[PDB]
Amino acid sequence: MASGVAVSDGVIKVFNDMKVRKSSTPEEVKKRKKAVLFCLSEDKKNIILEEGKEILVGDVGQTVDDPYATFVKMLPDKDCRYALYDATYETKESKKEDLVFIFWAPESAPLKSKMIYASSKDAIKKKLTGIKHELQANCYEEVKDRCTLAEKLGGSAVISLEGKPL
Amino acid sequence: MASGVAVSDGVIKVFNDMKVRKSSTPEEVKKRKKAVLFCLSEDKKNIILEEGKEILVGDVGQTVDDPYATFVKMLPDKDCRYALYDATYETKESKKEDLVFIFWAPESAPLKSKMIYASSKDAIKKKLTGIKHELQANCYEEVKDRCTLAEKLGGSAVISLEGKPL
Amino acid sequence: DDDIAALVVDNGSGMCKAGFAGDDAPRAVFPSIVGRPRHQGVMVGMGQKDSYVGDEAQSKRGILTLKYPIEHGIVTNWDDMEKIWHHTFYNELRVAPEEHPVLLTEAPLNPKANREKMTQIMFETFNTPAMYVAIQAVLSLYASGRTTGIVMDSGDGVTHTVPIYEGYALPHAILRLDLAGRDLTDYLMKILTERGYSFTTTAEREIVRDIKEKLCYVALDFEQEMATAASSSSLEKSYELPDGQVITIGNERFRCPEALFQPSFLGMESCGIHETTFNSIMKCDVDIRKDLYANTVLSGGTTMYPGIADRMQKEITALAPSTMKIKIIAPPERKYSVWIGGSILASLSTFQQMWISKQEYDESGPSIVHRKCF
Hints:
part of a larger assembly, 3 chains, A: alpha+beta, Severin, 8 helices, 33% helix, C: alpha+beta, Nucleotidyltransferase, domain 5, six-stranded mixed beta sheet, five-stranded mixed beta sheet, 37% helix, ATP-binding (chain C), EC 3.6.4.- (chain C), structural constituent of postsynaptic actin cytoskeleton (chain C)
C-alpha cells in the first residue's frame, strides 16, 4: 500500500491556524487550540477536522487543569482518530512547544474505520510535509501515561511534564 | 548592548553640589558629602540619589573616624548600587581629592536588580561626561581593602591613605 | 506578553538558541544545519522538497547535503540563513515576529558588508518592527557588572577572545580559534572510539552531546591524574545510553577538555587556547595588565565542565610573570550568560528610545546602523 487518502483542504486550514496562533489579545490566547481532532468523514474520500472534539490551552486556566487527560477521555480505543497536540512542557529553563501529531490507532477499534486509518498514515503525513515528532498508542494506558510524552523530550532533563506530574 | 538608562536630573543635581562644594562656614564644611549613594528607582526608568544612604566628611571629626569602612558596611553584595566617593588622601606633601565613581556590582547580588545595573554602566557614565578614575569591586574584600584605593594613586608614593592605614 | 517581549536570536557555528525578555535563559536551542540532495538522493523517486533546518535534518544527514549558513561566527550563504529565521519563529519559538521585536547576536569584528545586509533582510523579508545587533563577548563582561577586562568566550560553535575596555573591543587583541563546543563533541566521540566502542555513523554523533554535559570533567593536574587512571578503581564513571548499555569512561573524564589546553593530542602544532588568551594580554597596555587579571570572565557553551575553573587558575599562574594577584570572575549563569545579557535590556522603556526601527531604515537606508551606535 502507499497513501490511502488525498486531502480535502480542511486539515490545512485548521493546521495553518495553529502554526501562526491566530492570536493577539488575552481573549484569544486562551482560545488557542492545544489539541485538535482530525478524522476522515464518511466514505473516507476526504480528511477533515472534527467540530465536536477539540482541546483549548485556555481550558487549563478556564476550568480544566489537565488537557492531557481530557484527550485520554475523549479518545476511546472504540474510535480511531487523527490528532494534533501541542507539547507545552517545561524543561529546566522555561517552556516552549513541540508540534506533535498524535496517532490514535487502537487495534481493538472497529475494524472497518480503523483499517482505513491505519493504511492512511503515509497519506495523512504526506500532507503534513514531514512532521517533527510523533506519539502513537493503540491503548488507553500508553496515551494516559506521562512518560510517553516525556520520551520524546529525552526524559533525563525534564522535571515537570505539565509543571506537576513528573 | 549600549546604554540601559537615560537620566532623571537627580544625579546631576547632587553631583553639581559636590563639584562646587556648596560650603563656606565651618558649619557646612563638615556637612559636605564625602560619599553619595546612587541607585535606579523602581522600574529602572530613572536614575537618582538615595536619601537614606550617604557619607559626610564631617563624620570623621563628628564621630566616625573611618568613612571608608562605613561605606563597606552599607554596601552589601546583597544590593547593587552606584556611588561617588571623594579620595581625600595624603601623598607625601599634603592632601588633595580625586573624584572617583565607585561601582558596586557584586556578581552574587540579586540578579534582577544587578543585571540592569551591570548593563547601565555605559549609560550611567554617559551622563558623567567621562570620569577621571574609577574603582570597581564585586565583593567586600576588594571594597574593604586600602590597597585598591591606593592602586589608583600609584602606590609607591603614598604613606597614609587616611593618615594611618598604610 | 503585549508591549514588545523582544525575540532574541543567537547565531553561531552551531547549537543556535532563542527566547523572550525577562527570562533567565533562552527557551529553545537547535542545531544549525541545512540539507538538500546528495549522492543523487540515495535511490527511487528523487526531486521532492528538501531544505531541512533543525535536528530533524540530523537524521536525514546521510541523504541530504549539509551546508553551514554560519562558518565560524559569520554568514556566507544567506539562502540557508533565511530558512533558519523562518523556522525559528514559525516552528521553534511558535510566536509571531510581528508582535515581538527581534535582537540578533554577532561575532566580534563582524565584517561591514554583512552588517548592512542583515538589517536589510529583517525590514523587508520579515517586516519586523524593531531589531538590534549585539556582541556575545561584550554582554558577558557586561553581565558580571564590569566594563574593564578580558573575556574568553566559549561559544556554542566558535571561541573568540575579546578584551573589552569601556564598551570598545580591542582589534589588536582579538584572535579567532575554531574549537568551541560542537567540535569537542566530535572529538569526544573520536577518543571514545579508540578505547573500544563502535561509532561509524553520523546518526549516533548526537548521542555523545548528552555525554558531554554530564561526563566532561577537568583535572586539577593532568599528568598526575594520568598515573591514577591506569589502576582504574573509582575513576570509571557510569552513563546512560538510550538502548540500555552503559559506556564507562575512566581516564577520558579529564583528557577530553585537555585538547583545548593541549592541541598536540589532536595532531596540531598550534599553541593552547589558554596560552592564546595570554598573547592578547602581552600585546595589551602594560599599566592595565594587573587590572585585566582581576577582570577575567568565563562564559558560554562548554565552560560548564566541572573543574575547569580550577585548571584555569593553575595555567595562568604558570604563564604569568608572578608577584601578582590573579582573579577569575565566575557567574552562576555562565552557560546562558551570552543570551541572558541580550534578553534583559530589550524591554524596559528607555530601551524604546534606543531601538532601530523599520521606519528609520526606509529613510536613511543601510547607512543607519553605523551611525547610531555610540
